[PDB]
Amino acid sequence: SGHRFDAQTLHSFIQAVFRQMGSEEQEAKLVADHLIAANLAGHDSHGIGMFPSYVRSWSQGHLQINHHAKTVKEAGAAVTLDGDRAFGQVAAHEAMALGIEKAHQHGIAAVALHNSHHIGRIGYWAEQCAAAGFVSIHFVSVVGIPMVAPFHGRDSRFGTNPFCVVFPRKDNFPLLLDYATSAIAFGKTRVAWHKGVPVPPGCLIDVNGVPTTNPAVMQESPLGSLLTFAEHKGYALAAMCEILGGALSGGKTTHQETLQTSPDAILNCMTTIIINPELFGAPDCNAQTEAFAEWVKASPHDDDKPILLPGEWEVNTRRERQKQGIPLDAGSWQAICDAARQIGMPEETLQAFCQQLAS
Amino acid sequence: GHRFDAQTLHSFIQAVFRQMGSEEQEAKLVADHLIAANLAGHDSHGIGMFPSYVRSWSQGHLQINHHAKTVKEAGAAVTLDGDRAFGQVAAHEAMALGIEKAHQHGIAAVALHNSHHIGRIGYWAEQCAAAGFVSIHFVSVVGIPMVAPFHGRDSRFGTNPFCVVFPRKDNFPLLLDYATSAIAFGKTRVAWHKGVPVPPGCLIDVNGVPTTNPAVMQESPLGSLLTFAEHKGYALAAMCEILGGALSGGKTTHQETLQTSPDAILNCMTTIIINPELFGAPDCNAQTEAFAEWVKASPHDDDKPILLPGEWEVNTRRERQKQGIPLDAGSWQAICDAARQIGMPEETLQAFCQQLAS
Ligand SMILES: NC(=O)c1ccc[n+]([C@@H]2O[C@H](COP(=O)([O-])OP(=O)(O)OC[C@H]3O[C@@H](n4cnc5c(N)ncnc54)[C@H](O)[C@@H]3O)[C@@H](O)[C@H]2O)c1
Ligand SMILES: NC(=O)c1ccc[n+]([C@@H]2O[C@H](COP(=O)([O-])OP(=O)(O)OC[C@H]3O[C@@H](n4cnc5c(N)ncnc54)[C@H](O)[C@@H]3O)[C@@H](O)[C@H]2O)c1
């Protein structure tokens, strides 16, 4: 028995909860901006539901509040940053701003960010680049929490290592590819497990390497493992993200020495290439893009399942959720409220927010 | 079938292109790329392309003795028109210009539109990696719809490959190179000739119904390839269409741009080339090697060990350099027929066959 929450009011609440944690004003805003945007886009695993986990990471000495990305190298068209375990919502925002400026100066630039706390929905960083008028390409690794098996392997070796590319369009939503290199997102298994239903086949193996559709293998001991998408194809991409993101950013790849001591210590590396599309000799680019968009959607389909462009799913969800509210399941909401209580938000403050959110 | 010595097969291929009309350097460039594809184990893009190239040329698509022309040069980006040259020529010229530009700028891009078939994409990435660079390639196939969008029931775009490479000092490069379709078009051609099913989740028929019958890609009524991993391969195919086809200054697939022949294989490719040394990553080598060993330690069958991206092609090349390139009899017959079609004298062709047989 879930709820629908007004996005503006819920943002106010999320921001208040990070102030209570100790975040200063700008930090709390940056965190709330990213989390609410993930909820609006339909990517709820990276939304307000991350809050209890973030408190745990911080309490355990991993996530550091009120930190900033530090420049460790700047050379030609590339800047390299140490996220210093800051909120990824802070460090990646700082990284994009520096990278976008570098692309203004050089036409094509790169920003590498290692050792940032969880950077959330990667499409959000791409949207910043696209709003400034650039193409961007992002290789992301998750440092030292193995949860995905290599093709041919029977246990976890690397993170869900997302890949993201964006193409900006004048007066339209950007074409946005953004996804994990695993066969299914980790959060999907968490949802399926709570609901008592299986996941699709070809996504999971159990502790012994045997294919399974039971999501309990990702949520209870003995832990199994996620598979990569499309066998060797998702695996090749996950490995390229590990190396271009993890190693090439100046960060850590996953191996014995680098494993996290907690499942809440979620650290990302990201290498981003930012490209001014106007440098190319493509006078007909807009018309060719639009002609293809129209042609691809004319493919025969069920009425309830029209063809989408990359990034259109998020745009449509956002529109629905601005109008109807953000849905939160009752268990996640309880966990959120309980976590807010435990960091010292007074009961009366939480009551007043709940009354505002009931409207 | 047969097993052919790579070096002899190279001489043959080169001579066949001279006979077609290619000048020496073009014939060499075409032979280099085709034999490398066979050595790497990607036979669809190897010597077996020759009959299709002859058909394409005869129909006025592929042009012999053409070159990529620089149509724009702005900052770190160069844009080329391939002029329907052999892709083995146009893309070679594109990589050379792009690598030069990346020497100059640290990070550069080269866009190539309107090139004839550029073959195995990893080959261009290997040139970038050999010069010390990371490269990323978005490729579209112009106006040959073969693959359905996720939720669609017919073909709307090409097999649109994606490629990324990371160079390693004194080692093979980490090389991702694949089509965005669920299965290679070539594999369906093979499974048809051999009369076997393809795996499930790869094909739909003319009415959009799932099938394992490769007949649907080979006879009428034509069905369609699916993308890999549903929306995932579909989103990547669409980004390749746009970043490759549209942004390179080329054409995307839609009604007005459909080819009139299945052999009119024209590629657009947008390549970003990145000097990895610009990043502040003093432990990059060690972190890369540590990951490589760690990922291989995952429990596995002895006969199916874990590979790095690119390792498969490296191993195949070693095996085929030693054992020879295998060619199926039907393909070899098509190659010999195409050689006669472009006027190679019977005695020249026979001389080559005898040298290849021994
Ligand atoms: N920060 C991290 O370490 C981390 C790790 C893994 C995943 N993530 C994030 O989790 C989120 C979800 O990941 P996922 O792998 O579950 O993604 P997903 O399976 O939901 O894929 C979403 C992508 O596919 C597109 N898409 C959806 N439906 C489509 C359709 N019918 N046609 C064409 N395209 C369609 C979307 O527009 C988007 O590009 C992403 O935002 C990702 O960045 C973050
Ligand atoms: N228009 C075009 O020019 C065009 C179109 C489509 C495909 N192609 C080419 O066709 C070729 C084949 O495409 P495909 O989709 O069938 O490729 P594929 O399925 O053979 O995948 C090849 C990729 O996966 C990697 N790989 C293979 N086994 C692996 C393993 N066990 N672990 C990790 N990685 C592994 C390879 O090293 C390579 O990067 C490619 O070279 C592609 O460039 C060209």
PDB file of N, CA, C and O in Angstrom, chain B residues 148-185:
ATOM      1  N   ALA B 148      15.311  -4.988 -36.182  1.00  0.00           N
ATOM      2  CA  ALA B 148      14.108  -4.365 -35.659  1.00  0.00           C
ATOM      3  C   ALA B 148      14.369  -3.534 -34.387  1.00  0.00           C
ATOM      4  O   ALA B 148      15.172  -3.929 -33.536  1.00  0.00           O
ATOM      5  N   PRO B 149      13.647  -2.401 -34.230  1.00  0.00           N
ATOM      6  CA  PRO B 149      13.714  -1.715 -32.936  1.00  0.00           C
ATOM      7  C   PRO B 149      13.032  -2.591 -31.876  1.00  0.00           C
ATOM      8  O   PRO B 149      12.145  -3.389 -32.203  1.00  0.00           O
ATOM      9  N   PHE B 150      13.424  -2.449 -30.617  1.00  0.00           N
ATOM     10  CA  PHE B 150      12.718  -3.118 -29.548  1.00  0.00           C
ATOM     11  C   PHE B 150      11.272  -2.611 -29.582  1.00  0.00           C
ATOM     12  O   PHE B 150      11.043  -1.397 -29.660  1.00  0.00           O
ATOM     13  N   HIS B 151      10.323  -3.556 -29.545  1.00  0.00           N
ATOM     14  CA  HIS B 151       8.852  -3.344 -29.719  1.00  0.00           C
ATOM     15  C   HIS B 151       8.387  -3.339 -31.168  1.00  0.00           C
ATOM     16  O   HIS B 151       7.182  -3.329 -31.430  1.00  0.00           O
ATOM     17  N   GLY B 152       9.333  -3.335 -32.105  1.00  0.00           N
ATOM     18  CA  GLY B 152       8.983  -3.334 -33.518  1.00  0.00           C
ATOM     19  C   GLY B 152       8.921  -4.742 -34.105  1.00  0.00           C
ATOM     20  O   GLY B 152       9.502  -5.690 -33.563  1.00  0.00           O
ATOM     21  N   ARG B 153       8.237  -4.871 -35.233  1.00  0.00           N
ATOM     22  CA  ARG B 153       8.049  -6.165 -35.873  1.00  0.00           C
ATOM     23  C   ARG B 153       8.601  -6.214 -37.291  1.00  0.00           C
ATOM     24  O   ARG B 153       8.331  -7.155 -38.022  1.00  0.00           O
ATOM     25  N   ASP B 154       9.402  -5.229 -37.680  1.00  0.00           N
ATOM     26  CA  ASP B 154      10.146  -5.339 -38.937  1.00  0.00           C
ATOM     27  C   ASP B 154      11.475  -4.609 -38.837  1.00  0.00           C
ATOM     28  O   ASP B 154      11.764  -3.966 -37.816  1.00  0.00           O
ATOM     29  N   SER B 155      12.282  -4.685 -39.889  1.00  0.00           N
ATOM     30  CA  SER B 155      13.615  -4.094 -39.866  1.00  0.00           C
ATOM     31  C   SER B 155      13.593  -2.596 -40.117  1.00  0.00           C
ATOM     32  O   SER B 155      12.864  -2.117 -40.991  1.00  0.00           O
ATOM     33  N   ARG B 156      14.415  -1.869 -39.367  1.00  0.00           N
ATOM     34  CA  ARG B 156      14.494  -0.424 -39.508  1.00  0.00           C
ATOM     35  C   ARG B 156      15.911   0.141 -39.596  1.00  0.00           C
ATOM     36  O   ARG B 156      16.072   1.283 -39.995  1.00  0.00           O
ATOM     37  N   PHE B 157      16.938  -0.631 -39.246  1.00  0.00           N
ATOM     38  CA  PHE B 157      18.312  -0.094 -39.278  1.00  0.00           C
ATOM     39  C   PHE B 157      19.304  -1.243 -39.409  1.00  0.00           C
ATOM     40  O   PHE B 157      18.928  -2.405 -39.319  1.00  0.00           O
ATOM     41  N   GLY B 158      20.574  -0.901 -39.619  1.00  0.00           N
ATOM     42  CA  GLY B 158      21.603  -1.882 -39.894  1.00  0.00           C
ATOM     43  C   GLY B 158      22.123  -2.524 -38.630  1.00  0.00           C
ATOM     44  O   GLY B 158      21.658  -2.228 -37.513  1.00  0.00           O
ATOM     45  N   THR B 159      23.099  -3.411 -38.815  1.00  0.00           N
ATOM     46  CA  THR B 159      23.698  -4.123 -37.686  1.00  0.00           C
ATOM     47  C   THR B 159      24.662  -3.218 -36.890  1.00  0.00           C
ATOM     48  O   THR B 159      25.209  -3.635 -35.890  1.00  0.00           O
ATOM     49  N   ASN B 160      24.862  -1.990 -37.361  1.00  0.00           N
ATOM     50  CA  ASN B 160      25.402  -0.868 -36.579  1.00  0.00           C
ATOM     51  C   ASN B 160      26.348  -1.213 -35.427  1.00  0.00           C
ATOM     52  O   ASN B 160      25.945  -1.171 -34.275  1.00  0.00           O
ATOM     53  N   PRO B 161      27.614  -1.544 -35.739  1.00  0.00           N
ATOM     54  CA  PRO B 161      28.551  -1.942 -34.677  1.00  0.00           C
ATOM     55  C   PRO B 161      29.119  -0.810 -33.798  1.00  0.00           C
ATOM     56  O   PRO B 161      29.176   0.366 -34.200  1.00  0.00           O
ATOM     57  N   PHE B 162      29.557  -1.189 -32.602  1.00  0.00           N
ATOM     58  CA  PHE B 162      30.160  -0.275 -31.672  1.00  0.00           C
ATOM     59  C   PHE B 162      31.522  -0.862 -31.332  1.00  0.00           C
ATOM     60  O   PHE B 162      31.654  -2.077 -31.252  1.00  0.00           O
ATOM     61  N   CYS B 163      32.532  -0.014 -31.149  1.00  0.00           N
ATOM     62  CA  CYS B 163      33.896  -0.481 -30.910  1.00  0.00           C
ATOM     63  C   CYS B 163      34.643   0.465 -29.973  1.00  0.00           C
ATOM     64  O   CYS B 163      34.523   1.671 -30.113  1.00  0.00           O
ATOM     65  N   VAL B 164      35.394  -0.078 -29.007  1.00  0.00           N
ATOM     66  CA  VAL B 164      36.231   0.731 -28.098  1.00  0.00           C
ATOM     67  C   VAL B 164      37.507  -0.053 -27.855  1.00  0.00           C
ATOM     68  O   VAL B 164      37.466  -1.279 -27.690  1.00  0.00           O
ATOM     69  N   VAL B 165      38.631   0.644 -27.796  1.00  0.00           N
ATOM     70  CA  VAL B 165      39.906  -0.033 -27.605  1.00  0.00           C
ATOM     71  C   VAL B 165      40.727   0.697 -26.532  1.00  0.00           C
ATOM     72  O   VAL B 165      40.669   1.921 -26.422  1.00  0.00           O
ATOM     73  N   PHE B 166      41.488  -0.078 -25.757  1.00  0.00           N
ATOM     74  CA  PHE B 166      42.455   0.473 -24.811  1.00  0.00           C
ATOM     75  C   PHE B 166      43.833  -0.155 -25.100  1.00  0.00           C
ATOM     76  O   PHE B 166      43.979  -1.394 -25.007  1.00  0.00           O
ATOM     77  N   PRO B 167      44.859   0.669 -25.432  1.00  0.00           N
ATOM     78  CA  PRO B 167      46.195   0.102 -25.760  1.00  0.00           C
ATOM     79  C   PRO B 167      46.939  -0.372 -24.498  1.00  0.00           C
ATOM     80  O   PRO B 167      46.745   0.200 -23.424  1.00  0.00           O
ATOM     81  N   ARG B 168      47.779  -1.397 -24.622  1.00  0.00           N
ATOM     82  CA  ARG B 168      48.579  -1.847 -23.488  1.00  0.00           C
ATOM     83  C   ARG B 168      50.013  -2.010 -23.947  1.00  0.00           C
ATOM     84  O   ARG B 168      50.263  -2.575 -25.021  1.00  0.00           O
ATOM     85  N   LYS B 169      50.952  -1.505 -23.150  1.00  0.00           N
ATOM     86  CA  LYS B 169      52.362  -1.601 -23.531  1.00  0.00           C
ATOM     87  C   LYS B 169      52.788  -3.072 -23.600  1.00  0.00           C
ATOM     88  O   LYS B 169      52.586  -3.834 -22.649  1.00  0.00           O
ATOM     89  N   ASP B 170      53.341  -3.447 -24.757  1.00  0.00           N
ATOM     90  CA  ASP B 170      53.856  -4.807 -25.029  1.00  0.00           C
ATOM     91  C   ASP B 170      52.824  -5.926 -24.805  1.00  0.00           C
ATOM     92  O   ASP B 170      53.192  -7.062 -24.464  1.00  0.00           O
ATOM     93  N   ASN B 171      51.543  -5.601 -24.989  1.00  0.00           N
ATOM     94  CA  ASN B 171      50.500  -6.597 -24.916  1.00  0.00           C
ATOM     95  C   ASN B 171      49.435  -6.345 -25.974  1.00  0.00           C
ATOM     96  O   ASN B 171      49.454  -5.303 -26.636  1.00  0.00           O
ATOM     97  N   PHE B 172      48.526  -7.298 -26.176  1.00  0.00           N
ATOM     98  CA  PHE B 172      47.432  -7.051 -27.099  1.00  0.00           C
ATOM     99  C   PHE B 172      46.508  -6.001 -26.472  1.00  0.00           C
ATOM    100  O   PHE B 172      46.387  -5.926 -25.237  1.00  0.00           O
ATOM    101  N   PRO B 173      45.903  -5.145 -27.311  1.00  0.00           N
ATOM    102  CA  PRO B 173      44.950  -4.145 -26.793  1.00  0.00           C
ATOM    103  C   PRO B 173      43.650  -4.780 -26.310  1.00  0.00           C
ATOM    104  O   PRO B 173      43.223  -5.772 -26.879  1.00  0.00           O
ATOM    105  N   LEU B 174      43.036  -4.214 -25.268  1.00  0.00           N
ATOM    106  CA  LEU B 174      41.675  -4.582 -24.855  1.00  0.00           C
ATOM    107  C   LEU B 174      40.682  -3.983 -25.842  1.00  0.00           C
ATOM    108  O   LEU B 174      40.552  -2.760 -25.952  1.00  0.00           O
ATOM    109  N   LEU B 175      40.000  -4.867 -26.564  1.00  0.00           N
ATOM    110  CA  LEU B 175      39.252  -4.498 -27.754  1.00  0.00           C
ATOM    111  C   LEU B 175      37.824  -5.025 -27.724  1.00  0.00           C
ATOM    112  O   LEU B 175      37.620  -6.216 -27.818  1.00  0.00           O
ATOM    113  N   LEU B 176      36.862  -4.117 -27.584  1.00  0.00           N
ATOM    114  CA  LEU B 176      35.451  -4.417 -27.704  1.00  0.00           C
ATOM    115  C   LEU B 176      35.029  -4.062 -29.132  1.00  0.00           C
ATOM    116  O   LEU B 176      35.249  -2.944 -29.582  1.00  0.00           O
ATOM    117  N   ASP B 177      34.407  -5.000 -29.842  1.00  0.00           N
ATOM    118  CA  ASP B 177      34.022  -4.783 -31.224  1.00  0.00           C
ATOM    119  C   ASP B 177      32.862  -5.716 -31.542  1.00  0.00           C
ATOM    120  O   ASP B 177      33.047  -6.908 -31.695  1.00  0.00           O
ATOM    121  N   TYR B 178      31.653  -5.185 -31.631  1.00  0.00           N
ATOM    122  CA  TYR B 178      30.549  -6.038 -32.004  1.00  0.00           C
ATOM    123  C   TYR B 178      29.370  -5.282 -32.607  1.00  0.00           C
ATOM    124  O   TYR B 178      29.224  -4.071 -32.432  1.00  0.00           O
ATOM    125  N   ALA B 179      28.550  -6.019 -33.338  1.00  0.00           N
ATOM    126  CA  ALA B 179      27.285  -5.536 -33.863  1.00  0.00           C
ATOM    127  C   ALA B 179      26.292  -5.327 -32.698  1.00  0.00           C
ATOM    128  O   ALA B 179      26.430  -5.945 -31.635  1.00  0.00           O
ATOM    129  N   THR B 180      25.287  -4.477 -32.918  1.00  0.00           N
ATOM    130  CA  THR B 180      24.229  -4.222 -31.938  1.00  0.00           C
ATOM    131  C   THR B 180      23.021  -5.164 -32.145  1.00  0.00           C
ATOM    132  O   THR B 180      22.050  -5.126 -31.398  1.00  0.00           O
ATOM    133  N   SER B 181      23.101  -6.027 -33.146  1.00  0.00           N
ATOM    134  CA  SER B 181      22.116  -7.066 -33.327  1.00  0.00           C
ATOM    135  C   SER B 181      22.347  -8.261 -32.366  1.00  0.00           C
ATOM    136  O   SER B 181      23.424  -8.401 -31.783  1.00  0.00           O
ATOM    137  N   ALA B 182      21.341  -9.117 -32.209  1.00  0.00           N
ATOM    138  CA  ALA B 182      21.404 -10.227 -31.266  1.00  0.00           C
ATOM    139  C   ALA B 182      22.358 -11.300 -31.748  1.00  0.00           C
ATOM    140  O   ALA B 182      22.900 -12.029 -30.953  1.00  0.00           O
ATOM    141  N   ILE B 183      22.547 -11.389 -33.058  1.00  0.00           N
ATOM    142  CA  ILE B 183      23.389 -12.388 -33.694  1.00  0.00           C
ATOM    143  C   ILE B 183      23.895 -11.761 -34.975  1.00  0.00           C
ATOM    144  O   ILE B 183      23.250 -10.863 -35.517  1.00  0.00           O
ATOM    145  N   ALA B 184      25.067 -12.182 -35.433  1.00  0.00           N
ATOM    146  CA  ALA B 184      25.641 -11.661 -36.686  1.00  0.00           C
ATOM    147  C   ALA B 184      24.842 -12.146 -37.888  1.00  0.00           C
ATOM    148  O   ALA B 184      24.411 -13.304 -37.927  1.00  0.00           O
ATOM    149  N   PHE B 185      24.662 -11.266 -38.874  1.00  0.00           N
ATOM    150  CA  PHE B 185      23.993 -11.650 -40.119  1.00  0.00           C
ATOM    151  C   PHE B 185      24.663 -12.877 -40.734  1.00  0.00           C
ATOM    152  O   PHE B 185      23.984 -13.820 -41.127  1.00  0.00           O
TER     153      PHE B 185
END
